[model samples]
Target chain A: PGFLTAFEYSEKRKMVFHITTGSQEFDKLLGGGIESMAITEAFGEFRTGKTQLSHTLCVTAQLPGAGGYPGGKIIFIDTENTFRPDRLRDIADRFNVDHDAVLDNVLYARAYTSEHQMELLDYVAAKFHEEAGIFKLLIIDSIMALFRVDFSGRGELAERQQKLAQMLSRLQKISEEYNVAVFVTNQMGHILAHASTTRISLRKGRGELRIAKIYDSPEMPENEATFAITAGGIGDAKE
Target chain B: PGFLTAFEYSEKRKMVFHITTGSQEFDKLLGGGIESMAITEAFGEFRTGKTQLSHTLCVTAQLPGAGGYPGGKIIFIDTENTFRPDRLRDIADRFNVDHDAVLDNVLYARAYTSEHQMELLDYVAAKFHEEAGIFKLLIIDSIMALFRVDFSGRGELAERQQKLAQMLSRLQKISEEYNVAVFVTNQMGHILAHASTTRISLRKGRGELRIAKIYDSPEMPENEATFAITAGGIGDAKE
Candidate 1:
């Protein structure tokens, strides 16, 4: 017999995905169920439906139906103090979920500074890994609050970024280890320089875009995108 | 005006104020939105109502007869690939919002990794300031996916926490600067015998007790919930 060839292979863990129920017209943008175990970001100006989306997800994450990622829980880290039960109750009316039960599954927090905000991740990472091991979705609305504030002075730019890089690295580890879906709301900045020869110079240059990029950590290249904000919730921007 | 107090005192920017929709059930839980910003985290076994709540908020934020909080936009950062256009359509169906137009307004994204997830805040902050202006709400569907993957070992715990803190701080600033609402979803971790009780015990022991604490956030010391999730969209959690 010829020299025996040894087989080498390993079992892969099932990729658990987080699903979102797009409010009204926007669901089509998501290719069916929210990509499982994927991390997505949405960024835009104020009044752009960021919190609305979070509220919707809190309810939809528990909707019942085929193709629907049913029976999940949600954790909200409120940094901006926008969470309102009055609003969520209105949302609860739209689904079949037990209003109180749905509320029970949700965990809330208030983070003041960057250190406080990241502490949420630390708590979740520790809490999600334990027994009974529930929690399929994660959301961090407006991830830039702290860095934008603490790192206000230009000198703190590098330090702010370094901390951000480290924070992203930790999130990457959590996503893989738990196989839970993650989402974060982001805010955009402007393109300081204008086109050299734009025919209509006064035209309101391209409005700022929503950035949605997913990667494991600071070491990876960002899969960047620019999206729009509207009335229903969140949706893809025109390509 | 009082002798010492100038009329200008009232004109100064109010950094912390609750913006409620007049639903006492929902308002009570959120501690009155016009005051401080709050963060909510939700995660659990499948079939929970995470997304439903998100959609409901889109409608509630638009309530006209209620408080004049301004019917605004929603910025949804979708990770885990659960965002669905059909559901959002369903949500829009309940409200008078033009389905397609609402969809157009919503900003959505499909992120791939933890690094991408963390960077979303910066993206949104810039956009909020430049294009979206003042957002009524911000939401991240899933908050823990990346941390679960990247920060695994014991040695990496502190680093993970600091990073999460930075992210939290960013959201805090956005909420204050824009006077918008914020919400996030989180997953669960098992409790270990050796783990600290105060940190882990927040998850609550059993059923009834957990429900009462649903609206509580780490940032807020108060504990009265005012909202609930339902079928038609968000309304008063009880009303």
Candidate 2:
């Protein structure tokens, strides 16, 4: 067909699902939250709370439709050894959920190298199809760490970009096939070359946390929001 | 000559001054603070602390170099009857300065009609050149209020835009000639057509106050920051 059959068209017209980040300011700036079947990249310098947001989203994605979207599992791939179980427990406790159960729902993995990072994607694809409760959210915290370490110098730039592109394409395919949301954090250099559905940059501004939309879909305008990294999780900065 | 001569160019380069908005987050988002020799438009919905920011800037512009920029006077044109001396006093008291002295430095005016709004710009041009220690900052709180009220229906759209353009051009001229910063608050409708050097939009997100850079100069990138509206004035929102 030129476009889509009638039945396929109706399915496509259904509203895109989103999972709230648990911060109202963040959600509003995102026009709901991280959208399903799309890649949302958050990149920034050190200590801007990129990983903190990833952890917060891991917990918030479990809430029912009233809070955000239908409760589901999350797959978190940590490439920089920044993922903390204790932080996940803190976020879980803040939400008044059993910390162990929250941890149980999040499938965590550490990518030791760029090759391992790509392998993890393959693992996710296999597990997603085999399991009934597949991941609703996929997170790559510091997606560029291994690539930056493994492939250094101008000579390796071409190979690094090619491998990066391959990983992203697979991630995109899985997101669309499984109707999952893709959330990845990256360094400034990698993000400049890789285009995602929604691109957000985070940074510290004096005493506040800032997020800016570098690019987005037509329905979402380029905007930014501020939030605080709290003990509970990422929350609204007080006014 | 078509452009500045050697002597004039040096003089122009020396006066690239800026005024602080009293909010650290807001200042950093602006790549220092509100800049002189250009108009900066801050627009958003009601009660988003647009006027609070205007009042804060009125006071902060007078701070010493360490705190912000060199102290100077301000010219304020209030269109929505939103200016309050009492609020100014509150901000002044928080800064531990003489309230009367702060009030003395600010030249305030009320614009009751669209025609009056345009006339006020002419008055500013005449007064600014005549005075010694002329305003370092010019603020028009709610720049579109009078236009919105005076001009209704689709037929009047073109006329309203023309008048708005005229006022902005005069303001821009004053800014460049006198090395003064122009800060204008506008509604979404008016700002879309009237371009300024920097465009920022403010909004409320649950318990947080959010600011987004809608557009800006080459030196300033599009970004956002979070701050709080306190009794004293606008300040950093706690993270």
TM-score of 2: 0.48
TM-score of the B chain in each candidate versus the native B chain: 0.69, 0.90
Worst 10 residues of 2 chain B by lDDT: B1-10
What DockQ does each listed candidate score? 0.04, 0.01
All models, RMSD in angstroms: 24.0, 20.1
Residue-by-residue lDDT tens digits, candidate 2, B1-239: 11222223334535767677677778787766788766788867766677878898888888765433577888899998889878888888788889898899798999999899878989988888898455788899878767877876766665666566556656666776778888988776122222366778777867566565555442445467777787688888776
Which candidate leads the pack in DockQ?
Answer: 1
User: Model 1's A-chain: what TM-score?
Assistant: 0.70
Model 2 interface CAPRI class: incorrect
The candidate that wins on lDDT is 2
Model 2: pairs clashing at backbone N, Cα or C within 3 Å? none
